[PDB]
Structure formats: structure tokens, C-alpha cells
Amino acid sequence: GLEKTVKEKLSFEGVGIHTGEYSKLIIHPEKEGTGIRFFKNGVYIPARHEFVVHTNHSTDLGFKGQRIKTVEHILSVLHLLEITNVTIEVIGNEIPILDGSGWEFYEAIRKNILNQNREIDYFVVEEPIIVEDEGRLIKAEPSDTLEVTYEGEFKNFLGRQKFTFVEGNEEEIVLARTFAFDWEIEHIKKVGLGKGGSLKNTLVLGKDKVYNPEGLRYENEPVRHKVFDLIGDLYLLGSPVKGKFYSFRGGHSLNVKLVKELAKKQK
């Protein structure tokens, strides 16, 4: 496909899930070859794995003392829409969580795409690879299309679930919200995270119950969301990705480990 930017500036704002602070974004059009980058306090932070500074409960980037938490959801939307050149100006410390999914970003950006004049140089997975960390595993192999499977093993009523995204099915993952388990939330808050979490932006689950009155958007909403997260983390390769991926219990740390290994192999 063609490289793409946005036709005009687009703004989003709201609380961040981990900081609990209110932040604002402005997405700026950029010319071919710019890439995806964030901008904060005069500093450009490329959306690339070299700038990752944190991977526990979110993927965060930093450069020159300027940090932005929770980049994975906006990056996933940009990856899915193949937006390749933009600057995400951040006023604040975190990307807004909005409803917990990619939906608001996706709907606004998709109606505001500007095609550009050269084609995308995709990051094409060249050979099989596997990364592992204590029972968790992610595998990648060559594919002409982006295909991403996540398999979860939940210690509540959900049990085992799996879900596969393929190109053309973006609408199946951009509404899946972030989630949390009631028995884990105290620790998450104790370690300085989750300050903005609520039933308005998070699917909160117990051993045998759902806290949100509206319930789940899909019976497998959590694994759809984990696929969505992985697609955002994969964009830290710096180009839209072609490959077939399978994650068993992976999270941001393992996702970024895979990205760094792929980048090293194909440098």
C-alpha cells in the first residue's frame, strides 16, 4: 500500500489509565519518510523499540528526559490503518485511554487519511523465530499478510481462549477494551499504576463475575485486546509488519523482546 499520513490535525484528550492525569494529543500530518514519532516539550520520540523505557502493564517511550506512557493502543490503530508518517504531540505524560479500546482513535483517523506518493517498505519477517519467558512464548514466521493469534489461559471463569486477527478484520479488535482482574488491582495500584482505571475504561473481572454493568463486548474480549496490544508493540519495528504471529500468554515485555530480536536479525 501507499505511505499515509492524516489530512489535517486531529485532537484527542482524556484521562490516562496509569497516571490518572488528564492529557491531550494533537496528531500532525507529516511528509513521506518521517515515520511515526511522538513530540513532547520540544523533543521528538520516535515510535521505535530503541526508545522503550518500560514494559510492565503498558509500553512507554522516552528520549532526552521526556516520557510518554501507554503508547500501544494509538500505535496499534496507526499500524492497522497503515498510517506511516505522523507526529503525535502529547501535552501530558500518557496517551488518553478513552473507552479502553482503539475505537475512538480508529474512527477519527480512518476518516482523515491522506495517501502519499511512495509505497510502504514493510518489515517482512524473513524466517521463523521464537522468544520465551517462563511459560510464555511468542512465535513469528513469514507471511504476505499480517496475522496475529493470542492464546490466553485465565485463572477465572474465562479459562482458555484464543483469537486470530487477519488483515481486513481490523473492526474485530479495535473495540476490545483493556481489562483487569479484581484480585490483582491492589498490587497494580501499589506499584504506582492503574490510577485512571475505572469501569468506564476497563473491563474488570472477578473469579466468577463481571463488574461492568454492560458486560463484555465479546465473550473473548480479553484475548482480542491482547492481539490489539501486540499489533501496537509490533509497530515499534518502525514500519508496518508482514508476518504470522502466535503469542501464548505474552505481554508487553515479551512483545518488545520479540521486536528487538527481529530487528537485530534483519539489521
Ligand SMILES: CC(C)(N)[C@H](NC(=O)c1ccc(C#CC#C[C@@H]2C[C@H]2CO)cc1)C(=O)NO
Ligand atoms: C490488559 C493488559 C495487557 N494487562 C494491560 N492493561 C493493564 O495493565 C491494566 C488496565 C486497567 C487497570 C485498572 C483498573 C481499575 C479499576 C477500578 C477498581 C475497579 C472498579 O471496580 C489495571 C491494569 C493493557 O491493556 N496494556 O496495553
Ligand SMILES: COC(=O)[C@@H](N)C(C)(C)NC(=O)OC(C)(C)C
Ligand atoms: C500476574 O501479574 C503480572 O505479572 C503482570 N506484570 C502481568 C500480568 C505480566 N502484566 C501483563 O499481562 O503484561 C502486560 C502485557 C505488560 C500488561
Ligand SMILES: [Zn+2]
Ligand atoms: Zn492494552
